[PDB]
Enzyme design. Structure first.
Site, PDB file in Angstrom:
ATOM      1  N   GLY A 222     -11.542   8.886  -6.038  1.00  0.00           N
ATOM      2  CA  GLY A 222     -11.177   9.597  -4.826  1.00  0.00           C
ATOM      3  C   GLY A 222      -9.771  10.193  -4.926  1.00  0.00           C
ATOM      4  O   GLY A 222      -9.561  11.344  -4.553  1.00  0.00           O
TER       5      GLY A 222
ATOM      6  N   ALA B 140      -1.922   8.257   2.128  1.00  0.00           N
ATOM      7  CA  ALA B 140      -1.073   8.717   1.016  1.00  0.00           C
ATOM      8  C   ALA B 140      -1.746   9.862   0.278  1.00  0.00           C
ATOM      9  O   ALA B 140      -1.092  10.798  -0.192  1.00  0.00           O
ATOM     10  CB  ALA B 140      -0.808   7.578   0.047  1.00  0.00           C
TER      11      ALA B 140
ATOM     12  N   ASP C   5      -6.573  -1.703   0.193  1.00  0.00           N
ATOM     13  CA  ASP C   5      -7.282  -2.007  -1.022  1.00  0.00           C
ATOM     14  C   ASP C   5      -7.308  -3.503  -1.327  1.00  0.00           C
ATOM     15  O   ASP C   5      -8.055  -3.933  -2.186  1.00  0.00           O
ATOM     16  CB  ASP C   5      -6.660  -1.262  -2.183  1.00  0.00           C
ATOM     17  CG  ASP C   5      -6.769   0.236  -2.046  1.00  0.00           C
ATOM     18  OD1 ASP C   5      -7.701   0.737  -1.353  1.00  0.00           O
ATOM     19  OD2 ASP C   5      -5.919   0.914  -2.674  1.00  0.00           O
TER      20      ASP C   5
ATOM     21  N   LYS D 274     -15.001   3.986   1.216  1.00  0.00           N
ATOM     22  CA  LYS D 274     -14.386   3.885  -0.117  1.00  0.00           C
ATOM     23  C   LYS D 274     -15.498   4.003  -1.191  1.00  0.00           C
ATOM     24  O   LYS D 274     -16.571   4.502  -0.886  1.00  0.00           O
ATOM     25  CB  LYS D 274     -13.633   2.548  -0.221  1.00  0.00           C
ATOM     26  CG  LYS D 274     -12.461   2.414   0.732  1.00  0.00           C
ATOM     27  CD  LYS D 274     -11.255   3.259   0.290  1.00  0.00           C
ATOM     28  CE  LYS D 274     -10.101   3.237   1.306  1.00  0.00           C
ATOM     29  NZ  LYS D 274      -8.792   3.831   0.842  1.00  0.00           N
TER      30      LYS D 274
ATOM     31  N   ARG E  55     -13.343  -3.442  -6.921  1.00  0.00           N
ATOM     32  CA  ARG E  55     -12.659  -4.506  -6.164  1.00  0.00           C
ATOM     33  C   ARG E  55     -13.635  -5.589  -5.621  1.00  0.00           C
ATOM     34  O   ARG E  55     -13.286  -6.767  -5.558  1.00  0.00           O
ATOM     35  CB  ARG E  55     -11.765  -3.933  -5.061  1.00  0.00           C
ATOM     36  CG  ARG E  55     -10.703  -2.992  -5.606  1.00  0.00           C
ATOM     37  CD  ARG E  55      -9.518  -2.731  -4.665  1.00  0.00           C
ATOM     38  NE  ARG E  55      -8.726  -1.646  -5.234  1.00  0.00           N
ATOM     39  CZ  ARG E  55      -7.864  -1.784  -6.247  1.00  0.00           C
ATOM     40  NH1 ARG E  55      -7.582  -2.982  -6.755  1.00  0.00           N
ATOM     41  NH2 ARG E  55      -7.253  -0.708  -6.745  1.00  0.00           N
TER      42      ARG E  55
END
Length: 434
Positions: free
Chosen positions: A97, A170, A313, A340, A385
């Site tokens: 991404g 961000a 995250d 995500k 993750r």
């Protein structure tokens, strides 16, 4: 054929390990070096699938990048702001991404056309957050349903804009800041709540002029080559921090981990929960430190909203800490988790339930009742993750934990298994299925 992770419980973590480089910084460092003037040596560059996909995309457009994989080094010969060439094919951003969204801001002001795409997962991820503000700058981008594939019709006459972001991101800040560099006039970005500032810091490093509660840049400047040293990704350390915290008889130190304040969430919250984490050997070049973690018993908490953005995250692995803590933990304002690589709320809730934890879903979070992890089997949902979070869950589970489909761990942590075993957490790669 597939690969899975299989764990057995740990009798305590022990040792010193240096996690590999920061993904976020790595993406930005290579994109900026590519269009700078001169040669940039990048040490600590993360040699993961996501970061390498960024390199590969840049190479399609004439960036001169030498990959020295075994040493985590890149040698970039800058081609200057205007040195890129139109690629012949769609840029494959793989599963990343960050790549697709940062590339979009870089390519918005180019005098050529680019098609940006990726793998299935990437083709489900939302792009409105970047398409709208880029369009305000003069960009023209085609997309069916605000998801990749994106087709950018380059516009070298982009004009600056002042813009307030709806949510802290961000990636969006970075996207616009990049387009800002090729836009007539000033581009000013204001955030309701601070997001990680790696871009801003790299822009200063490359001697591009930066202003500031919001931040601004003027187009037509030049980036100057300047060697860069990437610190360890605290998102990768997060897995060992949680593991050592929850596994009895554990004492470890994590060397050269980045400790940028906009990334310290996992540590802040674990401490609130009762963790034993000490930051020492602090230094600067992006801030860096040694993190020492010892086993501690934890109490569930209500996760303060102000920490969500800075820890987004790390919730997968944090939620494993909540599962073995005493009492209830409630996560809210984390609807970003659903959009995500995979829907991370659904995926953790399913995994936790399969391992015997009372975990309840909320549109924007989860409610977890601390309890006792059992052995069992969970699916990674192809998310790096989720996979590692459950591998951490294996350290304390009453029995073995089989995590299916862990080929994507390399998107951010290529040497995860090796380091896990080295500090005493048992994880083996084994033949999968389907």
């Amino acid at each position: 054929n597939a690969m899975d992770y299989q764990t057995i419980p740990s009798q305590g973590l022990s040792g010193e390990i240096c996690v590999p480089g920061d993904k976020s910084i790595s993406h930005r460092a290579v994109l900026l070096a590519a269009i700078a003037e001169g040669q940039t040596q990048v040490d600590g560059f993360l040699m993961g699938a996501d970061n390498l996909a960024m390199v590969s995309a840049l190479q399609q457009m004439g960036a001169s990048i030498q990959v020295i994989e075994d040493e985590n080094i890149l040698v970039v010969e800058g081609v200057g702001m205007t040195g890129l060439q139109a690629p012949p094919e769609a840029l494959d951003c793989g599963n990343s991404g960050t790549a697709i969204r940062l590339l979009s801001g870089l390519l918005a002001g180019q005098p050529f056309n680019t098609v940006l795409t990726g793998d299935s997962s990437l083709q489900r991820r939302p792009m409105k957050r970047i398409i709208d503000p880029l369009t305000l700058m003069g960009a023209k981008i085609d997309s069916t349903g605000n998801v990749p594939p994106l087709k950018i019709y380059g516009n070298p006459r982009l004009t600056g804009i002042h813009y307030q972001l709806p949510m802290a991101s961000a990636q969006v800040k970075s996207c616009l800041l990049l387009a800002g560099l090729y836009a007539r006039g000033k581009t000013c970005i204001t955030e309701p709540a601070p997001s990680r500032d790696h871009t801003e810091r790299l822009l200063k490093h490359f001697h591009y002029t930066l202003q500031k509660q919001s931040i601004c840049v003027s187009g037509g400047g030049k980036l100057k080559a300047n060697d860069i040293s990437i610190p360890g990704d605290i998102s990768s350390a997060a897995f060992f921090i949680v593991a050592a915290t929850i596994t009895p008889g554990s004492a470890i130190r994590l060397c050269r981990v980045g400790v940028n304040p906009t990334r310290l969430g996992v540590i802040n919250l674990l401490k609130m929960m009762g963790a034993d984490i000490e930051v020492t050997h602090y230094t600067e070049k992006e801030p860096t430190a040694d993190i020492t973690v010892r086993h501690a018993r934890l109490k569930g908490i209500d996760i303060p909203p102000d920490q969500v953005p800075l820890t987004i995250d790390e919730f997968p692995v944090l939620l494993i800490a909540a599962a073995v803590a005493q009492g209830k933990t409630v996560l809210r304002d984390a609807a970003e988790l659903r959009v995500k690589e995979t829907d991370r709320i659904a995926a953790m809730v399913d995994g936790l339930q399969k391992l015997g934890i009372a975990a309840e879903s909320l549109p924007d979070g989860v409610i977890i009742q601390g309890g006792t992890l059992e052995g069992g089997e969970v699916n990674s949902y192809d998310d790096h993750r989720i996979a590692m979070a459950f591998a951490v869950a294996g350290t304390l589970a009453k029995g073995p934990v089989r995590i299916r489909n862990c080929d994507n761990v390399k998107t951010s942590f290529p040497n995860f298994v090796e380091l896990a075993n080295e500090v005493g957490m048992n994880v083996k790669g084994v033949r999968g299925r389907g």
